[PDB]
Amino acid sequence: GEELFTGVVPILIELDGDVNGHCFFVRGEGEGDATIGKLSLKFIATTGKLPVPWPTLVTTLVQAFSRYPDHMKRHDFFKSAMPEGYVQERTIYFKDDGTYKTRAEVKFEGDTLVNRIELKGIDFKEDGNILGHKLEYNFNSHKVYITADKQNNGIKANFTIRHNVEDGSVQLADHYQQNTPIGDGPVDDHYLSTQTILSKDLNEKRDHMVLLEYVTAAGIT
Amino acid sequence: KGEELFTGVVPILIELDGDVNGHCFFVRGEGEGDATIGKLSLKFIATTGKLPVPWPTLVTTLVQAFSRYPDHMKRHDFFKSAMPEGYVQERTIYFKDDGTYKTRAEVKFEGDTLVNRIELKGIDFKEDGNILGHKLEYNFNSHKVYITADKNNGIKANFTIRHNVEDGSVQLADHYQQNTPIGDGPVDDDHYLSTQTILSKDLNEKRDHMVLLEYVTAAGIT
């Protein structure tokens, strides 16, 4: 699957959501450089104003795009499942607040890699950090601990995301993940190091998130 | 159990999830029903803010098991016979010269509370129409609900709702209904339900809401 990631690969992102009854849609376009672990994307809300903070959707809207080191090439499930693709599911627990359930498909559509997502948010508190938009427009660096999931012939990941709040302490989001192959069966413990930058397109009147991310793999000597 | 469950007053919880021309919203209602007297008292609230559609259009979509069937009609009602397991209630509502509603609901007992859970999708509603334009008066007329057996082992119903418009004209809503029992062994003749509704507001409620009082009795058989 490594052969399809050579050079620059186009990216398409689609998300459908419902948070405490609030529907919304997001569309993103950009490109990815798996060889260099670089992502550049621009997101727009096609339904108006986003009812939840943009940082909370960062993890939900890819991962093939990670640069796995030469001695770790065989451990990249994300790239190995292409072009057929894989299904990615999560339950995100915001401490003392609501929860997100997500289901996505990542696959090639022509020469474009597409990520179509469905998320449902429930039990979010009124005037909370999420529904109250009290989260800073930024993102911290994290470690995505990946482990094999023999039963589903895929992988599982666990990590806690730290969302900066406008005053000083931070809002935690526990992430639980499962990735499963879509077709024919081509596949150790390790982790991903992530860095993200959120920004704004000054000539865009629509709600915008501009994204730059750098991801590498490690954990094996 | 299935009629024995409705002696006296039963608590009610109602939940609706909807999408009209892309505008999702949710409504939650709580109240009580006294099937012996065919009476309902409920309060509904929009938990997502302002309703993108007029409240009266959601009345029929929001517990016919509380209808009052006469002693000589005990056999006839199917609503209570399907309890406590409950029944599925589906509808397609066509508003004349406007959009359409598709609904799916499950009505059943959860403990001592009768619960009605709903999904509603509205399509092809016109901009500046009576519906999306909020031109319907805050009231509800009396109707007759025509029920017939669907020996899907349930029932079907057809009727036309009359919504008063602010200008004085009326917006019609054709209702097509299908009910199927969730589990086993329920009762199935042609007859109708006579309905009366009263809409009001809670003076101390800032959220978009609707207070409803309803009286339903059955007839059509001598």
Ligand SMILES: [Mg+2]
């Ligand atoms: Mg909904």
